[PDB]
Each structure stands twice: as structure tokens, then as C-alpha cells.
């Protein structure tokens, strides 16, 4: 993953039960923005037609 500078404190309940609050910086630095590669296969059968 990533080593993140993190503090342990409630924050207006935005981390109420276990939800995790982050900083737009972690997005601007792309610290977690990942990739996903997916394939699509178009086949060409040979119908009797």
C-alpha cells in the first residue's frame, strides 16, 4: 500500500464508527489512484447461413 501520515482522533463524527477520513492531498498525489485492465472478446462464429 502506502505509508500515510495518520492521526487517531474523532473528527466531527466523519469517522463515526470505523469510516476513514482522508485529505485531498492523498488524491492529488495519486497515492491510491489505481488502474484496472479488462478485456472484451468479440467472436466470429460460422453459422450455417
Amino acid at each position: 500500500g502506502q505509508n500515510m501520515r495518520v492521526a487517531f482522533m474523532p473528527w466531527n463524527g466523519y469517522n463515526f464508527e470505523d469510516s476513514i477520513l482522508v485529505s485531498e492531498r492523498v488524491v492529488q498525489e495519486d497515492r491510491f489512484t489505481t488502474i484496472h485492465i479488462q478485456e472484451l472478446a468479440c467472436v466470429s462464429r460460422d453459422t450455417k447461413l
Binding site: 466531527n12 463524527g13 466523519y14 464508527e17 469510516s19
Partner: protein, 1337 residues
């Protein structure tokens, strides 16, 4: 339209009437042109056109020409939809049997013919010969035969002897069977017959025949000759990217069977070699069997995939059949799914919503608002606009959902709250924000738990969702009237930190002119958030109804509490905010706010509480660092001590000075003591670790540590976890459950040695596996529950009865667990409750006992209240309002319609996930009451217990019993009665390994029938030298004294049997086996002395086996009728035993396994139901012996015990309705005036209405007996069947309802849900009563 579902067999005529042709060829589709083949499983001619209003041959393509068949391919021209209903039929070349009526135990054919199912099986499959019509020779109409027998009778006779085999044999055999003749014949023969099981079989078969003749079915229909085939639509042949088609199993089975049929017919015309046609008929029977059911008689697994083919029955039964897959719960189409987050800025009734999901859902409402606004007067342009997301669409959506509620739903909806409503708001991202409190309601964590959404669209539905399932209307859990919306964590911490008191903090000692003043002071940083100060506050008060006095008092508080006071809504007195304000305190605050100020101020108060809690928690900065959880320094020492302790204990064993088991126990005990000491050390070093100073030397205040600010606040986790963290972790469990010698000396702030972590892993994995299984088990249990009670709906308003159950404050041998006020709260009393000022009517008999009533009750300290159950209500098909008592989740009495059955089943099944898988000492003062005892004094002036069910009670001076015990038999009583004694002052002691034969008159003792060697042996105390007679009973000894038994005599100063003083009967004592007797001849006796010292689950499965009411292993034999005990002819395999009532007739002799011991001697005299042999009790016996009130109190006690053990609470109403459901059937005692048979089980409600109507007339009612069935069976034997069809079996219930013609009127939640109409429970109750009052004449 309709109001009932008729069901019965179908004549071949009927089946053929359903048909639209006779498919002949198995082939489905031409491949060179993908067209349905003529005379095939998709033949357009036989089913319908493949394309709408388009002939197959292309001769017509116009809607006008609809209705004319073609002439080049011959197919009707309609919409393609008709290919969904046209059923086909197959002419079976030979008759054949229907597997269902033939194998579903019990075989309907077998019962119909009084024939062994083995025989009918062996004759269907062509292996034997059944002779029919029984000609003049020695042959029968029903006898089976074999090959050699067959041809031997043939050589004996070529006629008057009709032996056949296979289907047509069965057909002709049924067809000539005179039904009503056999019926009345067996009828007149029934009362003639008296052998029990014969009578039972007779009445079963006679009921079958009577239902048959009453139904329209005819026996020959039970053998198919034409076979209907499903429409082509419902068994589709969907292709793939190429010529690959998903050949549904139905098509393949149909291909197989039609192939067999064609082949067999072609053989029939072709000269028919006999053995070949025989075997082919057998094979065709097998094939049609497999088609109707791939299950029985073997397997017909598909090719290339070693797994069975989907039978027709498969498409019905199981979790995949249409019932549990598309009828009951169907995949909805209209709304959404996502994962959730918190977003606490929003009010309690609101909820988040992603803009994308919103835009996708209300798309129809979007089009509507756009068209009505004319900005897009064509649906196409509407789609374009919503595809381009021009801001116009955005604010249009914002307007269109301004009040439009929606439904948030957890995945497993355990109880009623699992689905709730909210007014949505628009946010970004893809998550679903929601208020925190309600996420605690769902048991919805934020670990990635996904929630579904559901928009209600029709106006009635939207207004409904606003009225009922909006969160702001569900604060009291319907299970227990406790508030379900409780601030759980991360907000309780905030307040608890705020409402605390640091001794010398910045600002202590000031005086504040109001809460707003102190708030301004704190925000400007001029004073701490918690320092003692003096503030003036005007706690508004509702003295009389409607008024509001305002006392501007001057209270000493903390600025924290001063600030928090700004939220209470002019109600509650200040005294509710002045304390530390823990979690339980918050629940208390919310509850009293709700009770005093209605509802709306309370929801506002809760919202404000959550807001301010989050705010001041963030302002706090509560944070857990490693140095917070301070280790108690002395712990080490303690360990060593205990360690050194166990060390020398090992010496105690290494020197053999102590036994091994006591050594183990001693290790356990010293470790437990050291654990408690180290826990108290950790606490005492944590809870008050802070030491500070106020303008002076020093003070000791409660600790401000981060830990114990979460624990003591009750925020998250209790001390049972802290002491596990800081202090010693303690012992851990072996896989079996044993305890390891050496506990985990370590802790968590310190590391763990490998082995320590290993044992911790043992424990944790056990727990995890327990949860992982109990989840599914509890799911199945709660499903059975909701099924067996899916019909109870409060319909009448007052049954107008008087039978109630005696609700009493429960006592368990310790202190009172559930006070009477906790149980009887909110339930209408049965009869007038007398003030214990006897002949003072405290409360009348139709009073909804609410809180002020229960307080007026407990004031006068009543004993127990006869109260209206639900099992005692009298209304037919549903229970009356007043019997069900106070509706929970609200305050009013129940309203007519609440499907209390379902809410009760849910409330019971939900907490299932929280389940698992010598002396008697008084405790307080008061009298010493004794029940069921015949007290005779001893020579030692004490009292002797001389019965079997002697109950000790300790009552208080105020009249309520505080303690109770079961004082065993023969235990001496060292205490009188009314003796006000303190705790621990013993009343009775005894030894469990004895069972004396205490007398009731003094004098000497004599022997009678005391024979040495034959019936008794001579055994000595070889370790002291003493001697004794060992009475071995019949079997143990030689048979020459088996039939003979001994009798000891309580003789007077002479040697003559004396009569019981008080009556006119002798008293000599038979002593059982192993009776080790010492009393010599003619020796003085003590009054009540030991003549002979005769030597002597848990989790969810417990409640499961309870509700199933299954016979517990080794049940406690009870007493059917009273009398004197005497074992009959001994050792009939079992040990027989007759008991003769004082004068009641004793035609019964119960046989108890002599292996199993016994709890009653011979010369004993006790009434019915007494424990003849100790052990668990079968609830059936409880019912059938001591009524229904006894068994229902027993069940409620049992299950409430199992739930209290886990601390969860369930109001007794729920288990109460469940027990009312599991016994609604009754078995008939006599014939009665009407036509109710003997062994005919029938709905006790229907028996009640029949007896009611008859006793209204001149006749006399029919005598019944309340039966009892496990929830499963009690659900299957339901009046309606479609319910019981859907529920669990759906292959017996269908067959039975079919053979009996069970016309099913719905009147049930299950059906009305299935068929797709309204529900009798909710507003649908109003609709149905308006239907029955007007639309039903």
C-alpha cells in the same frame, strides 16, 4: 376476481382439454434455418407463432389478418405471447404411473389399496404379477404373484384368473374398486375393531377414502395415460453466440420420454415380442418417472456434467423453485444498490444519495416533470436531455424528490427495522450517506456493508412509507419497548468528556449569567471545557398538564454541562445533566425526554445531541497512545507469587502429598485469584491514576486517561476487555473446553510468547467458527418461525373472556431475575386484581396496565396477576386486541391489523445471532413456606421431608416471595416456619447419594419377606467390620426370588403392622434393588428415619429443540393417573409397572426400561403428572397431563431463561404467540354430535366453532383434546396449503391437497403475498374488511 384456489387431480379428459395438440417428434429446431420444427417441442402449429402477428410461412404479416390459421405451415396468427400458455399433451402409448402418488411416503396408492408399497413398486416395474377380479379359483383381487406362479395358474386356468403387470393392471384394479362401499364397510368395521394401531390405520384409510369420494377425483386418474407438456416459453431454448443452445433439462427429459413413447408404439404395431414390449414399458415408466421427478428410484444425471437433470418438481421445491425464488421473494427492478458512509451533518429523517443513482431511479418522474414543464414534450427528447444532464434536469430532479421518501435496506433484514424510509438528499460520489444512529439500528457497520435502496412509486405507497417506516416513527424496538435509537459510540465519548469535572481547571470558581454566557466564555478560550463554576439556570417544569413553571435557580455545575444544557427542550429538570453522563445515562435522558415531551421534541433533542457530541468530541481530541494503558507495576510481583505458589504445589504433587485432580483444581484456583488481584490492581491504578492540586496541596480525581474515558463512559468495550489489555490476559480454553494450567501471564501492551498467542488462537477460532455456523442456523430457525406464525393478525377487538395465565415474578433459586413489573408491564389483566388488603379491588379486569398502573401495583406489593394471554384469546382466525395487550414499539393498545405473528417471529429469531453453540441456604428474612410436603417430625426434634415435590419458599414481610428452592426427599429440616432468619442460615441438609424410606410413626421395625440369599444377600462393611443386607431386586438375584420382593414393617412395641395415624391404611415399605438396609429385627425406629440408603444444548440448538417440541432423550416419565405403585409381571424386556388409583380404574401398565432408574417406590400415593423418574420433560406430556397453561408457562420460562443467559431481552408476548401457534390443532376424544371421528386431528378453532354452533342448538359439543405439534408440522397441517406448499416440503402437501381436493381460501399473508393482492395485515386489513362487509354480500 377470484377468492380461492381449487386443486385436485385431473382426468385424462381434463388434461387433453388443456392441450393444443399432440407433439410427436422430439426434434426441436431446424439448424440450416433456425425455425421451430413441425410436430416438435416448439412446433408453432401446436403452440403459436414465433413472431407477433406473423405467420410462420410468411403468408401474413398484418394485424388485420389476426386469427386465421395459415395453410402452408398451418399456424394461427396472434401475438407471440400465446406461446406462454398453450400447453401440449403426449399420448403415452401405454399407461404409466405417477411417481408422486406412488412414492411420496406414505404411498397414496398403497394406502388406497391396503397394499404393501413394495408390491405395487414391483408390479409397476414389470417384475411380478398382480391378480385382479379374483375368479373362482384360489386367486384374489389384490394378491401379487410371480412368474412360475403365474404360468402355473395359467396351466390351471386360462380364464377366471386375470393376472397382469404394470400400469394397466393398477388402472383396472383401481377402476373397479367400489369406493363408498369399502368406505361404509370399513366404517362399520372400525368401531368393531379395537386394536390400537389397527384402529389408527383404519381411520387413516377411511379418511382418505371419504375425502376421495367427497372430492371429484377418480382413482384411475392417479395413473397417467396422457402427459401434459409445459408451454414452449417457460422452458426456453436460448442460443449462444453461435449454434450453441442452452438445452434446458426439461427439453432433454421430454426428448427422452417422447423417444421412448414413439419407439414403444412402433413396436406395438410391429407384432410386439412380448418380453420386449414388457421391458420397454418398464423403461418408459422409468423415463416418465424421471421427468416428473429425477429423484426417486435412481438417477438420470445429464451428460458431460455429472449432476442430475432439473426435474419438474425441482422447478418447484428447494430454494430454487418458483416459490422461494420468484413467487414469495421476486427480484425487484426499480431501485439501486450501493455501499454506505456516515455524513453526520444531516438530520435524523434524512439520508444521503448519489446524484447518479438518483438520476437513474426517478427517470420516470424526471420525464413527467419535464413533459409537464414542456421543456421536452417528447419522450425521445426527454431521454436525450437526461443523457446530456443539462442543469435544468438537475434542479428538476431536486424538485421532484423534494418530499419523495425512499427505502434503505440492509442485506440480511433480521427484524422489522431491517428496512426503513428516509427523505433523500443529493450528494456526490457513489456512496449512500445515512444518519449514524439508524446505522446502529440496522446493526449496520461501516466495514463496506452494502445497502439496497427502494423507491416507493404509487401515491398510496409513498404516503405509507412516510407514515409507517420513516425512521422518525420507529424509536422503540418492537421486540422490547426500550429505545432502539441509542447513541452508541464516538458521540457518547464526546458528551462524557464534556460533562466531566477536572478539579482545578482554568476558570474554576467563577459565576456565569446563563449557559450562553459560559459557552461564549469557553469558545473564546478563557476557560476550560470542564471546570466547576456557578451558573443560573431556569429549568422549565410541567407541574400540571400543559403548564410550564420556570425556576431561575442558581446551580453549581461545570461549563461543559452548562453548555450542554442549551439543548434540552424546556422539559427535563437540570438534575439529568449534572452527572458524568455516561452511555446508560444518555439512554435514560432520551427515554425520559420521550416519555415527558411526546415525540417531536425528542427527535429534535436526539439530533442536537448527536451534533454537539460530534462537535465536542472533535474539540476534545481523545486519542489512545501506547503509554496510556499503563501496566500496574506490581503485576509482575503478583505473578511471581502465584508462580512461586504453583511451584510448591508441584512439590505437593511431585512428593505425592496431594492427588492430581485436586492439584489441577488448586492451580486453577490460585491462578484465578491472582487474576482477580491483578485486575483490581490495574483498575485501582487506572480509574483514579490522576493526582492534581487545587490552589494547594493535592487531590485525587477520577482519571483523564484516554482509556477508561472510553470504558467508563461505556463508549466502546467494557473493563472485561481493558483488564485483558493492560493486566494479565488470564486463562484460555482448550478445544474441548478445558482450561490450560498456565494462563497467559503476558498482556497486550507487552508482547506474547508464541505458545500464548497459540492458545489465544484456539479460543478466537472457536468463537469465529461458532458465529460462522450460527448465522445460517439462526436464519433457518427464524424462517421456520415466521412461517408457522405468518397468519396471526389482530382482528377482533375484545374476545370477552376470563381465562388468564398467572404471571408471577420469576425466581430461580437465586435472586429474582425478572421482577413482576418487568413482565406484566403493558398487558391487559385477565380478572380483577385485588389489592393485598384482601377484598380490595386494586385494578379492574379490562385495564391496559401501563406504567402508572404497574407502579400503583408494586406499591401495594402484589403477589402475581392473572393476565390475559394470547393463547387464551377466543376469537376465531386471529386474536383479539385486548388479549395481545399493549402494542410495543408504541404506547397505545394494539391496532387491528398489526401482523403480530410476523413481528414476534422476527423479534425472536433476530437475537439468535447473539446465542452460542447437597445444601440449601436462605438469603434474606421472612417466613419459611413449604409446598407439597407431608411433614413428620424426627426423634431429633427436626422436620423430615416426606414427599417428592417439596418446594421451599422464602417470602418477605411485604408479602412477595423472595427466594425459592427444591428441597429434596428425605432431607431433614432444621428450621420451623415463619422463622425470620438472615442469609446463609441453612434450612435443610441431606446427601444426594441416598433416598431413605422414612416412616411416619415410631416404634420398632420388623422384617417381612426379607430372605437372605434368595431375595437379599449378606454384604458387610469390610473396611470397618459392620454388616448389612443388600436387597438386590428381581433381575439381579436368582429368579427363584425374582417374583418376590421384601417389605419392612414399622411395628409398634409388639411386632404388628400399624395403620397410618390419620387414615385407615397400613404402612409397610417395599424396598427396591441395591437397598442397603441396616435396621435389625425388632429395633426401635426414629420417626422418619433412613431405613435404606439407596445409592443415587445451551445454545441456539436448545431453543430449536424447544420449539420443535421433540421428545428429549430419556424424558422424565410423569404420572398419568394417581394411585399406588406396583411393578407388574417383571422383566418383560422392559420393567412393567401398574399403578392403581385410590378408586379410579387402572387399566394401564406403563413399561419403563429397568435399566433406567426410578423416582417412586411402590406404596407411594401421588396425583397425576408427578415426576415418576427425573429428567427432562417432553412438552407433549406436560400439555396432555397438566393442561395448556402449564406447558405455555414452561415454554416461556425455558426460552426466556436461554435468552436471559445471554442478556438479550424479549418480551413474553412473542414466544407467547408462538406457543399459541404450535398447538392450534386438537385431536378428538369422542364422536360428538357432529361427524368428527376419533383419530381425526383438526383445527381446534374449527372444533370450537362447531361445538359452539351445536351447543347453540339442541345437541351436545364434541369432546376434544389440545394437541401439540412442532412448528414444522404445526405449519404443514395448515388449513390453507399454498402457504404450507411454499414453506418446506412442497411435495407431500401438494399431493395431499390434490388427492383431497383442498379448496384453498386465502385469508393469509403467505397466499395474498404469493397471488399478488393486498395483505390482510396492514391497510390491506381495512381493504379486506370493506370487501367482506360490502363486496362479499
Amino acid at each position: 376476481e377470484f377468492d380461492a384456489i381449487k386443486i385436485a387431480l385431473a382426468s385424462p379428459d381434463m388434461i387433453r382439454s388443456w392441450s393444443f395438440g399432440e407433439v410427436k417428434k422430439p426434434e426441436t429446431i431446424n439448424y440450416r434455418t433456425f425455425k421451430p420444427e413441425r410436430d416438435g417441442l416448439f412446433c408453432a402449429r401446436i403452440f403459436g407463432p414465433v413472431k407477433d402477428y406473423e405467420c410462420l410461412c410468411g403468408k401474413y404479416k398484418r394485424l388485420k389478418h389476426r386469427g386465421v390459421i395459415c395453410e402452408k405451415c398451418g399456424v394461427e396468427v396472434t401475438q407471440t405471447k400465446v406461446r406462454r400458455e398453450r400447453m401440449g399433451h403426449i399420448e403415452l402409448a401405454s399407461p404409466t404411473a405417477h411417481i408422486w402418488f406412488l412414492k411420496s411416503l406414505p404411498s397414496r396408492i398403497g394406502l388406497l389399496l391396503d397394499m404393501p408399497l413394495r408390491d405395487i413398486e414391483r408390479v409397476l416395474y414389470f417384475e411380478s404379477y398382480v391378480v385382479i377380479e379374483g375368479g373362482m379359483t384360489n386367486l384374489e383381487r389384490q394378491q401379487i404373484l410371480t412368474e412360475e406362479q403365474y404360468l402355473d395358474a395359467l396351466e390351471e386356468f386360462g380364464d377366471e384368473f386375470d393376472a397382469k403387470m404394470g400400469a394397466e393392471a393398477i388402472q383396472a384394479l383401481l377402476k373397479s374398486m367400489d369406493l363408498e362401499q369399502e368406505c361404509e364397510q370399513l366404517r362399520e368395521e372400525l368401531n368393531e375393531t379395537n386394536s390400537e394401531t389397527k384402529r389408527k390405520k383404519l381411520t387413516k384409510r377411511i379418511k382418505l377414502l371419504e375425502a376421495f369420494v367427497q372430492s371429484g377425483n377418480k382413482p384411475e386418474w392417479m395413473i397417467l395415460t396422457v402427459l401434459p407438456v409445459l408451454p414452449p416459453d417457460l422452458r426456453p431454448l436460448v442460443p449462444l453466440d453461435g449454434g450453441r443452445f442452452a438445452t434446458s433439462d426439461l427439453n432433454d427429459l421430454y426428448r427422452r420420454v417422447i423417444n421412448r413413447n414413439n419407439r414403444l408404439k412402433r413396436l406395438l404395431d410391429l407384432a410386439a415380442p412380448d418380453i420386449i414390449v414388457r421391458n420397454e414399458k418398464r423403461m418408459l415408466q422409468e423415463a416418465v418417472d424421471a421427468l416428473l421427478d429425477n429423484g426417486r428410484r435412481g438417477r438420470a444425471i445429464t451428460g458431460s456434467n455429472k449432476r442430475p437433470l432439473k426435474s419438474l418438481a425441482d422447478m418447484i421445491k428447494g430454494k430454487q423453485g418458483r416459490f422461494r425464488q420468484n413467487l414469495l421473494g421476486k427480484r425487484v427492478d426499480y431501485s439501486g444498490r450501493s455501499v454506505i458512509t456516515v455524513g453526520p451533518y444531516l438530520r435524523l429523517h434524512q439520508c444521503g444519495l448519489p446524484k447518479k443513482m438518483a438520476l437513474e431511479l426517478f427517470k420516470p418522474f424526471i420525464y413527467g416533470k419535464l413533459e409537464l414543464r414542456g421543456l421536452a414534450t417528447t419522450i425521445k427528447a426527454a431521454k436525450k436531455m437526461v443523457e446530456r444532464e443539462e442543469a435544468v434536469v438537475w434542479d428538476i430532479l431536486d424538485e421532484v424528490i423534494r418530499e419523495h421518501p425512499v427505502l434503505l435496506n440492509r442485506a440480511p433484514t433480521l427484524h422489522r427495522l431491517g428496512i426503513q424510509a428516509f427523505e433523500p438528499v443529493l450528494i456526490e460520489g457513489k456512496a449512500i450517506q445515512l444518519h449514524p444512529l439508524v446505522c446502529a439500528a440496522y446493526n449496520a457497520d461501516f466495514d463496506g456493508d452494502q445497502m439496497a435502496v427502494h423507491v416507493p412509486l404509487t401515491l398510496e405507497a409513498q404516503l405509507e412509507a412516510r407514515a409507517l417506516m420513516m425512521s422518525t416513527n420507529n424509536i422503540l424496538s418492537p421486540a422490547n419497548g426500550e429505545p432502539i435509537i441509542v447513541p452508541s459510540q464516538d458521540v457518547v465519548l464526546g458528551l462524557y468528556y464534556m460533562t466531566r469535572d477536572c478539579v482545578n481547571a482554568k476558570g474554576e470558581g467563577m459565576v456565569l449569567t446563563g449557559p450562553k454566557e459560559a459557552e461564549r466564555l469557553y469558545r473564546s478560550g478563557l476557560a476550560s471545557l470542564h471546570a466547576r463554576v456557578k451558573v443560573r439556570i431556569t429549568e422549565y417544569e410541567k407541574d400540571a398538564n400543559g403548564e410550564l413553571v420556570a425556576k431561575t435557580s442558581l446551580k453549581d455545575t461545570t461549563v461543559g454541562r452548562a453548555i450542554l444544557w442549551m439543548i434540552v427542550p424546556k422539559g427535563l429538570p437540570y438534575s439529568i445533566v449534572n452527572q458524568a453522563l455516561g452511555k446508560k445515562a444518555i439512554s435514560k435522558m432520551l427515554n425520559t425526554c420521550y416519555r415527558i415531551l411526546g415525540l417531536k421534541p425528542t427527535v429534535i433533542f436526539a439530533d442536537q445531541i448527536m451534533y454537539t457530541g460530534f462537535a465536542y468530541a472533535a474539540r476534545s481530541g481523545a486519542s489512545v497512545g501506547i503509554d496510556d494503558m499503563v501496566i500496574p507495576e506490581k503485576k509482575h510481583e503478583i505473578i511471581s507469587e502465584a508462580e512461586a505458589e504453583v511451584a510448591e504445589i508441584q512439590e505437593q504433587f511431585q512428593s505425592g502429598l496431594v492427588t492430581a485432580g485436586e492439584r489441577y483444581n488448586k492451580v486453577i484456583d490460585i491462578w484465578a485469584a491472582a487474576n482477580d488481584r491483578v485486575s483490581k490492581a490495574m483498575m485501582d491504578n487506572l480509574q483514579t491514576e490522576t493526582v492534581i492540586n487545587r490552589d494547594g496541596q493535592e487531590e485525587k480525581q477520577v482519571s483523564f486517561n484516554s482509556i477508561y474515558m472510553m470504558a467508563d463512559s461505556g463508549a466502546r468495550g467494557s473493563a472485561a476487555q481493558i483488564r485483558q489489555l493492560a493486566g494479565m490476559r488470564g486463562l484460555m480454553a482448550k478445544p474441548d473446553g478445558s482450561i490450560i494450567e498456565t494462563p497467559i501471564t503476558a498482556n497486550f501492551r507487552e508482547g506474547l510468547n508464541v505458545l500464548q498467542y497459540f492458545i489465544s488462537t484456539h479460543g478466537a477460532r472457536k468463537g469465529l467458527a461458532d458465529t460462522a455456523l450460527k448465522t445460517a442456523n439462526s436464519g433457518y430457525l427464524t424462517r421456520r418461525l415466521v412461517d408457522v406464525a405468518q397468519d396471526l393478525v389482530v382482528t377482533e377487538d375484545d374476545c370477552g373472556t376470563h381465562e388468564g395465565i398467572m404471571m408471577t415474578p420469576v425466581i430461580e433459586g437465586g435472586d429474582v431475575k425478572e421482577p413482576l413489573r418487568d413482565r406484566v408491564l403493558g398487558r391487559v389483566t385477565a380478572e380483577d386484581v385485588l389489592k393485598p388488603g384482601t377484598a380490595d379491588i386494586l385494578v379492574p379486569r379490562n385495564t391496559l396496565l401501563h406504567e402508572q398502573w404497574c407502579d400503583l401495583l408494586e406499591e401495594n406489593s402484589v403477589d402475581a396477576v392473572k393476565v390475559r394471554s394470547v393463547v387464551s384469546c377466543d376469537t376465531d382466525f386471529g386474536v383479539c386486541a385486548h388479549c395481545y395487550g399493549r402494542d410495543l414499539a408504541r404506547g397505545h393498545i394494539i391496532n387491528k391489523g398489526e401482523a403480530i405473528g410476523v413481528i414476534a417471529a422476527q423479534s425472536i429469531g433476530e437475537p439468535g445471532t447473539q446465542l452460542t453453540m447437597s445444601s440449601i441456604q436462605v438469603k434474606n428474612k421472612g417466613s419459611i413456606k413449604l409446598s407439597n410436603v407431608k411433614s413428620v417430625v424426627n426423634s431429633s426434634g427436626k422436620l423430615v421431608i416426606t414427599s417428592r415435590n417439596t418446594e421451599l419458599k422464602l417470602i418477605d414481610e411485604f408479602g412477595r416471595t423472595k427466594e425459592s428452592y427444591k428441597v429434596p426427599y428425605g432431607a431433614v429440616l432444621a428450621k420451623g416456619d415463619g422463622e425470620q432468619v438472615a442469609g446463609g442460615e441453612t434450612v435443610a441438609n441431606w446427601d444426594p447419594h441416598t433416598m431413605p424410606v422414612i416412616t411416619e410413626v415410631s416404634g420398632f421395625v420388623r422384617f417381612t419377606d426379607m430372605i437372605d440369599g434368595q431375595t437379599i444377600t449378606r454384604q458387610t462393611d469390610e473396611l470397618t467390620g459392620l454388616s448389612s443386607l443388600v436387597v438386590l431386586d428381581s433381575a439381579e438375584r436368582t429368579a427363584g426370588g425374582k417374583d418376590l420382593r421384601p417389605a419392612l414393617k414399622i411395628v409398634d412395641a409388639q411386632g404388628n403392622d400399624v395403620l397410618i395415624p390419620g387414615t385407615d391404611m397400613p404402612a409397610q415399605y417395599f424396598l427396591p434393588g441395591k437397598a442397603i438396609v441396616q435396621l435389625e429385627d425388632g429395633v426401635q425406629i426414629s420417626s422418619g428415619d433412613t431405613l435404606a440408603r439407596i445409592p443415587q444444548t445451551g445454545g441456539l440448538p436448545r431453543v430449536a429443540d424447544l420449539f420443535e417440541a421433540r421428545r428429549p432423550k430419556e424424558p422424565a416419565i410423569l404420572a398419568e393417573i394417581s394411585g399406588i405403585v406396583s411393578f407388574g409381571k417383571e422383566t418383560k424386556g422392559k420393567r412393567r409397572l401398574v399403578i392403581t388409583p385410590v378408586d379410579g380404574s387402572d387399566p394401564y401398565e406403563e413399561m419403563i426400561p429397568k435399566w433406567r432408574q426410578l423416582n417412586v417406590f411402590e406404596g407411594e400415593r401421588v396425583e397425576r403428572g408427578d415426576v415418576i423418574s427425573d429428567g427432562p420433560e417432553a412438552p407433549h406430556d406436560i400439555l396432555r397431563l397438566r393442561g395448556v397453561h402449564a406447558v405455555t408457562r414452561y415454554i416461556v420460562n425455558e426460552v426466556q431463561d436461554v435468552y436471559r443467559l445471554q442478556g438479550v431481552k424479549i418480551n413474553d408476548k412473542h414466544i407467547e404467540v408462538i406457543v399459541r401457534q404450535m398447538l392450534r390443532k386438537a385431536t378428538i376424544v369422542n364422536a360428538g354430535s357432529s361427524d368428527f371421528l376419533e383419530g381425526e386431528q383438526v383445527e381446534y378453532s374449527r372444533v370450537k366453532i362447531a361445538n359452539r354452533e351445536l351447543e347453540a342448538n339442541g345437541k351436545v359439543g364434541a369432546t376434544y383434546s389440545r394437541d401439540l405439534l412442532g412448528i414444522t408440522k404445526a405449519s404443514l397441517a395448515t388449513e390453507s396449503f399454498i402457504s404450507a406448499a411454499s414453506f418446506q416440503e412442497t411435495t407431500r402437501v401438494l399431493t395431499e391437497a390434490a388427492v383431497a381436493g383442498k379448496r384453498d381460501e386465502l385469508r393469509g399473508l403467505k397466499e395474498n403475498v404469493i397471488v399478488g393482492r393486498l395483505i390482510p395485515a396492514g391497510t390491506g386489513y381495512a381493504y379486506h374488511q370493506d370487501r367482506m362487509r360490502r363486496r362479499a354480500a
